[PDB]
């Protein structure tokens, strides 16, 4: 498998790891997930409510559930901001 | 770094590896990128213009250039379809 395939499988497997058989994430799943995968990101926001800011606009419908596609829009937003950073600076 | 951070980086770097210094993808770059990164996916499209058709969907500004956000939209579409199939037949 190519690198991208591995990347994709990883994202897919990470979602299911923290969402469980319920097949979706609650705020708390999301919060744990961010804590295990993006700890420096959270600590650089001096806000005990970052997961709440983030949960808010993932949950367009207010059902407390975040599915895979919404999960992917979170990863998309971060990776995009990292890339912008990267382009402006690191090369 | 985390599994997610690793996966994200490979997505970032894959873009840049095929976008080169110009920082975007032409339909040629896109075609090469999917040939190397998802060959089994192309090898299953009966359509020979399939790359061309993906390019048309991606190229919102119709300037022949595909940037990182568009790129991520591609990976999105692919990863979400995989996950859909995954849930139905595999989980």
């Amino acid at each position: 498998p190519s690198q991208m395939e591995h990347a994709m499988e990883t994202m897919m497997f990470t979602f299911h790891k923290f969402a469980g058989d319920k097949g979706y994430l609650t705020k708390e799943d999301l919060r744990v997930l961010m804590e295990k995968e993006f700890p420096g990101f959270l600590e650089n926001q001096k806000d005990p409510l970052a997961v709440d800011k983030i949960m808010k606009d993932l949950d367009q419908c207010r059902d407390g559930k975040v599915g895979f596609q919404s999960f992917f829009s979170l990863i998309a937003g971060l990776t995009i901001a990292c890339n912008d950073y990267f382009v402006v600076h690191m090369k | 770094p985390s599994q997610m951070e690793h996966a994200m980086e490979t997505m970032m770097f894959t873009f840049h590896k095929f976008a080169g210094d110009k920082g975007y993808l032409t339909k040629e770059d896109l075609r090469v990128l999917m040939e190397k990164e998802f060959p089994g996916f192309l090898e299953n499209q009966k359509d020979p213009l399939a790359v061309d058709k993906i390019m048309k969907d991606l190229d919102q500004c119709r300037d022949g250039k595909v940037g990182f956000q568009s790129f991520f939209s591609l990976i999105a579409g692919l990863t979400i379809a995989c996950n859909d199939y995954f849930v139905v037949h595999m989980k």
């Binding site: 998309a76 995009i80 901001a81 | 969907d57 991606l58 956000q69 999105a76 579409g77």
Partner: peptide, 16 residues
């Protein structure tokens, strides 16, 4: 088994 290309719907983060 169909692949569509999502026009997201992306949360934004800053600096930079």
């Amino acid at each position: 088994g169909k692949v569509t290309f999502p026009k997201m719907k992306i949360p934004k983060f800053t600096f930079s």
